[PDB]
Amino acid sequence: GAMNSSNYAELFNNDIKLFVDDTNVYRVTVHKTFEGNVATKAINGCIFTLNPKTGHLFLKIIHTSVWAGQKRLSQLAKWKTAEEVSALVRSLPKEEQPKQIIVTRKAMLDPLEVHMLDFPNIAIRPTELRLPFSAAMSIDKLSDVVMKATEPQMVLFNIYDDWLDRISSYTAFSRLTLLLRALKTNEESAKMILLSDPTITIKSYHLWPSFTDEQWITIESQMRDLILTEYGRKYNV
Amino acid sequence: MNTVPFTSAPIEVTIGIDQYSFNVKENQPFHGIKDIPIGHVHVIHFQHADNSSMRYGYWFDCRMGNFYIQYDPKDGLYKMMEERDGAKFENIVHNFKERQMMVSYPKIDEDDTWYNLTEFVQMDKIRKIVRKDENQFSYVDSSMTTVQENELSDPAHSLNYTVINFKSREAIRPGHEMEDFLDKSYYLNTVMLQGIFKNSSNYFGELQFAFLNAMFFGNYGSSLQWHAMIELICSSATVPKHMLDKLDEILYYQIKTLPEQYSDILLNERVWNICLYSSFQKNSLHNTEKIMENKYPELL
Numbered sequence A: 001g002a003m004n005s006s007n008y009a010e011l012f013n014n015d016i017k018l019f020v021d022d023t024n025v026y027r028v029t030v031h032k033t034f035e036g037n038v039a040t041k042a043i044n045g046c047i048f049t050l051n052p053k054t055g056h057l058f059l060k061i062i063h064t065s066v067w068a069g070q071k072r073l074s075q076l077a078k079w080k081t082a083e084e085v086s087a088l089v090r091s092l093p094k095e096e097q098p099k100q101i102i103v104t105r106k107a108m109l110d111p112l113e114v115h116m117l118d119f120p121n122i123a124i125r126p127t128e129l130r131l132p133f134s135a136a137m138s139i140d141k142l143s144d145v146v147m148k149a150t151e152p153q154m155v156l157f158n159i160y161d162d163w164l165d166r167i168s169s170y171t172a173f174s175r176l177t178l179l180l181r182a183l184k185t186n187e188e189s190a191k192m193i194l195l196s197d198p199t200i201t202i203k204s205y206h207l208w209p210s211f212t213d214e215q216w217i218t219i220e221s222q223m224r225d226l227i228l229t230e231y232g233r234k235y236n237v
Numbered sequence B: 001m002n003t004v005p006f007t008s009a010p011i012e013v014t015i016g017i018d019q020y021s022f023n024v025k026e027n028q029p030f031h032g033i034k035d036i037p038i039g040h041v042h043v044i045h046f047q048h049a050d051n052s053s054m055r056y057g058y059w060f061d062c063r064m065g066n067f068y069i070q071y072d073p074k075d076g077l078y079k080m081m082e083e084r085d086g087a088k089f090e091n092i093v094h095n096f097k098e099r100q101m102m103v104s105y106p107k108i109d110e111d112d113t114w115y116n117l118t119e120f121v122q123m124d125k126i127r128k129i130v131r132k133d134e135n136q137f138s139y140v141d142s143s144m145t146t147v148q149e150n151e152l153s154d155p156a157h158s159l160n161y162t163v164i165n166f167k168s169r170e171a172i173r174p175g176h177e178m179e180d181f182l183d184k185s186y187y188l189n190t191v192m193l194q195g196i197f198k199n200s201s202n203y204f205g206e207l208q209f210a211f212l213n214a215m216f217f218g219n220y221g222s223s224l225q226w227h228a229m230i231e232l233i234c235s236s237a238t239v240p241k242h243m244l245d246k247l248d249e250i251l252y253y254q255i256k257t258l259p260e261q262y263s264d265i266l267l268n269e270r271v272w273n274i275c276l277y278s279s280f281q282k283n284s285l286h287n288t289e290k291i292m293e294n295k296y297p298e299l300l
């Protein structure tokens, strides 16, 4: 059924699974019209489809042209997400297709379930975790590829860089979610922390800086402080 | 006017006939029910005084044969049977009528309730879901499960209602996922009406039958089938105008007839609130909405 803190290690077993997060599929700026009314302008978005074991991220870019002349866009966005996830599964070889797909938001369940009817053995699941995948657009290189897109496009990343060479997938996923939680609660401070030392660079083929093991501990520590800090600055504690 | 003769009444039982019911005491001199309106199906049902568990009964149509009730002390129930010897039967009935041992089906002349609840309910069709072909009448009880229930265990004793499932390949055209899931007109009009039921009368008949089994036997899977069939129409943007007018009448009389104290179980809050207030046909069920608001405003 639903995925939560009790069955958290199942993410890192050998049954292929994907997380799907649709938060950033339909993105708008809200503005005033000459007549003093409000209007939205859509900007490019993405589906965040992530294998939590391997780090493989299938970033389907959603070009604003997909909304042209469509109504009830927030509702369409969920079905478009489902259409694209289903098209992704069908494009994968059978032995790479997921056994489960976990949606981060419950409103995706019925749209994905209907689009995956042809895949009765793929279990579509919600989660009670509050995962920070909405902050994926705070990762500069992912934001850059979405905004520059001039057509629908799928880009493949490994969101863990080379981390799996040194750490387990459980640890890699805990780092990832800590970074993204920080970027979601205070993006500026989070990005300040990640780059404050000019000597640590981001490899052209990576997303995040090339920290040593020790430097990663210091980083992770500073990100938890930030999250606790903001939790105070928010609630005054 | 036709007659259903009871060999005897050896156990205390509440007897239903259509929407009417009467108590019979252990070994009371009861020998059946007379003056049954020809032209309609009928149901005659039973609830033993000792074990209110298992309401059971028999759908029948007096035009199709001479039918009688006799208690079976081995299986412990009142069984319907057919008498093929017409004169043996006329003579049995005439004697019990002369001795005034029968209750009269008590139809008020003004009263169209039973007609209105069974308008699309034929009896040869009833037997296509309650499969027992050696009999002209059909047994139903509280605990029989439907074909669809068994998919999610004895097949001979099942209710073979039409399977409706909104998240099935049958209901959803490839490439029309969103369209077909949010407006079910394709599934209603093409798959079910044109494909399976053939016409609105076969749709209405199954639906009316589902309701009556839910009300009379507390058959849960019937209740599920009745809600599903309502939800498929209400969730279709394109329904023939005659079907909506007729549906409004059908549901009106079903809601009118439901015992006031059984609404809590027999009525699905989500389905009704969706059908009356959110669905495409939210404005097309005036009579049904008005009786539901005046009779069961709590559900809503």
Ligand SMILES: NNc1ccc(Br)cn1
Pocket: B005, B006, B007, B008, B068, B069, B083, B089, B092
């Ligand atoms: N076996 N024939 C019949 C018919 C009617 C009644 Br009542 C009893 N026996």
Ligand SMILES: NNc1ccc(Br)cn1
Pocket: B120, B121, B122, B123, B125, B126, B129, B201, B202, B203, B204, B205, B206, B207, B209
């Ligand atoms: N209109 N004929 C029908 C259809 C279904 C059932 Br059950 C009964 N009579």
